[PDB]
Amino acid sequence: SEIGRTTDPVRMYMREMGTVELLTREGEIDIAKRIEDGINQVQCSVAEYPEAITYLLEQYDRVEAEEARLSDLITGFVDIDPELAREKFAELRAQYVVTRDTIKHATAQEEILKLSEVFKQFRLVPKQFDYLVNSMRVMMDRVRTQERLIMKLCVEQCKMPKKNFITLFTGNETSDTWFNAAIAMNKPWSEKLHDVSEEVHRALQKLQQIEEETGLTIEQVKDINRRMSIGEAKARRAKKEMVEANLRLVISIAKKYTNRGLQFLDLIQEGNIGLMKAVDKFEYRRGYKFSTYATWWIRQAITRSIADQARTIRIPVHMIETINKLNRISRQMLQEMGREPTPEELAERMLMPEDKIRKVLKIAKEPISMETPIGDDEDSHLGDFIEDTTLELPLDSATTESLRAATHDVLAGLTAREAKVLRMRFGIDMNTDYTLEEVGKQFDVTRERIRQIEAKALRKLRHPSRSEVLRSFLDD
Amino acid sequence: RLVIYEREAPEGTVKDIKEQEVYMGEIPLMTDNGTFVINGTERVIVSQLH
Amino acid sequence: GPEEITADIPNVGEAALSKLDESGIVYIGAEVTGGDILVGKVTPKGETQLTPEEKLLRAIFGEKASDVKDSSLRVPNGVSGTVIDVQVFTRDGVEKDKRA
Amino acid sequence: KSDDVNGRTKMYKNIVDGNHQMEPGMPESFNVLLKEIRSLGINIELEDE
Amino acid sequence: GNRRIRSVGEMAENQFRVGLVRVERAVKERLSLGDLDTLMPQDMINAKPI
């Protein structure tokens, strides 16, 4: 056994990946058949709940007047043109209505099963079928969460036996007939929850609407949903066997992308995501091999992840493709001319203007490491030569402080009103500068008078008696 | 010379040959005095005792 | 915007532009010393974000702020030589000045 | 002289004012060190009592 | 007698052979594709690795 011998996650992955053998042309077909039988079982278990079929026939009468098209409702039929769907929808509606009234109780299990097997014929688009199964999951999980809030409160009270709290709770479904039997033992635990016997009502009386909103029994709903779970675990275990058998295909494709910015296991994992999508989308009834379809999705995922995350500064996919196209045009022009082309002629063989190609050539460059050795030494690196350009020079800070002092000096040599409106008009020793109207309203004076005051104060400061300190803070 | 053999023969004889001149790289030339001008500056490739 | 080789440099007197030709490049044969401008160049800048004190300073003396900053090539300090050669390499699509 | 960023401009202004006194703070590379040890899973901290 | 001189004309040849195998893998990869009857040799030669 090779366990504990290597550190490489590539070797560990290849080691655990090679323990699944490749499928034949026949192995892919019956794995795909297992997937489609799992999904068919999920659908025939969905058919027991009626409102999903009601929503689907709502969708069809919306297709009738074209609020939508049935090309988005069904992908085809198995025993898309819109005339056969009329036949199948009519025969399905004639089944749903003939099931709706027949309620009894042994007779009620003939029509539901034949409607299930006649609803099996519709191979829906994934969106509608997923909507139906998620709708049923929400119905069953809210019903289930009040089902276990029934026991949530029973744990809120005291010690919790529910080994035999389930004895006659099954089947009554209308009232507290099962609830009265709990105090019939008169053990202390059977005390507690009973004084909460009123507060429990709106849980199991909210059942009062839902058993009138679903039509079928609590365990009937729960068990068609557990049959849905069995069907989807069959379809999910069969999808896992098709992904696990085809990981060599992903490595086979991913080895051709190995040095474009992403590492080999990164490419393998992105291609594995593409392969899982391919398994979800594959159709074996087209007669093609799984490799033929799956290569498209694996290559899509790998190239998309290279466009997404191979670069520090991310370039969008449209510019990534412009760069790739420019590069292969440059390769052709370098081969056919023996000389690296200039952007002028590189813009004439391409369809693009020259100023567009110049920025495309300036746009595709990867950052240098600041641990790059300069001089190819190991003592001085590129980061040692890069300067903080946001630092204020200490002579500039000292000039700023001297200028604050000088304007403080000249503003002390003005009237208190003029120095105030001139410290307020500008942001001097305030956090914000003000407009003529704000300075005026603070003084309860007009805008134009404040303009006059500040213009006069500026004219005073223009005189060389008050200006020779400040004129030193100017340049050529 | 791209020489194409056909599929099935005990000899594998040629369908055709497409022979032409490809440009693979430029080789830096040594000057009359044993130096190379590389990115404008004269360089010396020191010999190696290995 | 593009940087511009020019003899029209802000905050630099006519004395420091004495040995630059009309293209802003030093003459060949010019005896220069440290700090002398060899090639005059200005970089376009913006958003000067004036401090309130220097904002008042420019309100009193009415001096506009430069939209460009002096980015010239100067002689290194302590170095005093003679300009013996000037080469101008211009890109295709850029217009050659009188010196080029 | 090297890393105290606020203290070195104060020192320049103090030299220009004829006051040869320093107000030294923390070197900036010690703050870089503290932030780089915390970028490991390690809580390094100045006990400010 | 155990230490040997390797000079520019040999080190350059070794690096050229390195570039030649870097292009050889891509030429062997391109020939495995079925585009084989319409391409010239200068379409499968990439001068940039060399």
Added chain:
DNA sequence: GCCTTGACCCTCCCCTAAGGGGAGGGTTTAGATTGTGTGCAGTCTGACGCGGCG
């Protein structure tokens, strides 16, 4: 001089009709393909922790 007043004036931002141009983002793509692929190294010397033998 202090203070209003009515008339002007500035820049800046958003709007016009009928789309053009482009950036940046999604999606699928069905002959068949099913395990990467590089080096490199002329260090020595302590010193510590551990499988494995006794």
